[PDB]
Amino acid sequence: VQLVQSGPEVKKPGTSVRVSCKASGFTFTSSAVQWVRQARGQRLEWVGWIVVGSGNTNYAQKFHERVTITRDMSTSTAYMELSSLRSEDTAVYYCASPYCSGGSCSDGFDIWGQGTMVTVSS
Amino acid sequence: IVLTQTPGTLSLSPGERATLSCRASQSVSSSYLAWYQQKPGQAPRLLIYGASSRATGIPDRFSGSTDFTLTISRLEPEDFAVYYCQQYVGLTGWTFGQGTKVE
Amino acid sequence: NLCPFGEVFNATRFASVYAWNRKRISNCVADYSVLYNSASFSTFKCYGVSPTKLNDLCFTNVYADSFVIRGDEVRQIAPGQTGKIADYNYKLPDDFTGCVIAWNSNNLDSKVGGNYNYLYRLFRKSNLKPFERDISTEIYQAGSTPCNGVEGFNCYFPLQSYGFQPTNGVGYQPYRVVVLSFELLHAPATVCGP
Ligand SMILES: *[C@@H]1O[C@H](CO)[C@@H](O[C@@H]2O[C@H](CO)[C@@H](O)[C@H](O)[C@H]2NC(C)=O)[C@H](O)[C@H]1NC(C)=O
Structure with missing residues (x-):
């Protein structure tokens, strides 16, 4: 039971970044994935979440306009893309999900990815 | 919503007990509030969910409870970490508190 | 006295798969050859019966369970199968007897947007x-x-x-599916071919 996150990224200001998390060991298709980001030395900020089965998404108002979360059942993978990157966006992004087995899921986000640094720079 | 997490820093030696406080700006369902522990350099893990229930793997050193707290019955060297509260109420507007650093 | 297959196959609207529409067909002649040799179907798969002998075997009832699903899920409408449709919307028994008929209705059901x-x-x-x-x-x-x-x-x-x-690939195009369940009970057996 793990959630394995993609590697680090370096992007220019104004471009988009694609980050993803591949689930294994649990019923990914019955779970939900939330994304948060953390600047170094700062608090966790919530970005948004997706219900894996439904494909339904909700986003924090701060990023809403430029953030999209999707998923693909065939690879048990959740994806997030943040458009129009700003220098201030530099942060470590994390993904998390509840543990699901059969028809039952846990009541909180027990499974966390490792975190990927995304750098916005010249 | 705004979750106010206090103290900024809690200084307390090992072997002692501590209480961390996350104050909601409104009444919220206890069922959707949770506490996380982030050992620096690592992704956070769930400790308490539903305000009072222990997450799997959480020892009796910890327990749960607008005023939500994390109860630490006793501190061991590995229990010194930044603790965060999270609110899952509704479909959107989920938030985290500032995080309490316990030393 | 022919069976009202036109009311099933040429219907303006079809039910959602979560709430499939069960039409009971009784006391009529089922000219199954019209459907079988229509060549307008992409799928015509029979279980327990031969598709060209449908006329000879009489049933107590014929049930036409009508619904819309996407192409990739058509393979789930079969006995012994599992999956989102097979398990949560419409499940056929392992000993199902009858025929599963489906066709591509992309140009009828898909909408712009x-x-x-x-x-x-x-x-x-x-x-x-x-x-x-x-x-x-x-x-x-x-x-x-x-x-x-x-x-x-x-x-x-x-x-x-x-x-x-209208721009979906075939696996995501809509298909109209009609499952004709053949039920034989302690009964007079009222539905037969011509
Ligand atoms: C649904 O309607 C179509 C159109 O009327 C029917 O198809 C016709 O059937 C007659 C009789 O065999 C043929 O002479 C026509 O050439 C067919 N037209 C087309 C476009 O195929 C069809 O049989 C009807 N479906 C059912 C179950 O009654």
Whole structure:
């Protein structure tokens, strides 16, 4: 039971970044994935979440306009893309999900990815 | 919503007990509030969910409870970490508190 | 006195798969050869019966269970299968007898911008029994906490729509599916071929 996150990224200001998390060991298709980001030395900020089965998404108002979360059942993978990157966006992004087995899921986000640094720079 | 997490820093030696406080700006369902522990350099893990229930793997050193707290019955060297509260109420507007650093 | 297949196959609207429309056919002549040799179907698969001998075997009832699903899911409408449709919307028994008929209706059902009037069940507490029709809209509780009518974490609306669009690849195009279930009971056997 793990959630394995993609590697680090370096992007220019104004471009988009694609980050993803591949689930294994649990019923990914019955779970939900939330994304948060953390600047170094700062608090966790919530970005948004997706219900894996439904494909339904909700986003924090701060990023809403430029953030999209999707998923693909065939690879048990959740994806997030943040458009129009700003220098201030530099942060470590994390993904998390509840543990699901059969028809039952846990009541909180027990499974966390490792975190990927995304750098916005010249 | 705004979750106010206090103290900024809690200084307390090992072997002692501590209480961390996350104050909601409104009444919220206890069922959707949770506490996380982030050992620096690592992704956070769930400790308490539903305000009072222990997450799997959480020892009796910890327990749960607008005023939500994390109860630490006793501190061991590995229990010194930044603790965060999270609110899952509704479909959107989920938030985290500032995080309490316990030393 | 022919059976009203036109009312099933040439219907303006089809039911969502989560709430399939069961039409009972009785006391009539079922000219099955019209359907079989129409060559307008992409799928015509018979179980327990030979597709060219359908006229000779009489049944107590014929049930036409009509619904819309997407192409990739057509393979789930079969006995012994599992999956989102096979388990949560419409399940056939392992000993199912009858024929599964389906055709590509992309140019009829897809809309510009997406036709979202067709729904299927994603979340259910358990799998369906054969021919069970569950049309409840109660919020699914994935966790141990009651939803109390409110959607949120671990609280999901059980149904989701199909995004049927004119630009979809075949696997995502809509198909109209009619399953003709052949039931033989202690009965006079009223439906036969010509
Ligand atoms: C649905 O309607 C179509 C159109 O009327 C029917 O197809 C016709 O059937 C007659 C009789 O065999 C043929 O002479 C026509 O050439 C067919 N037209 C087309 C376009 O195929 C069809 O049989 C009807 N379906 C059912 C179940 O009655």
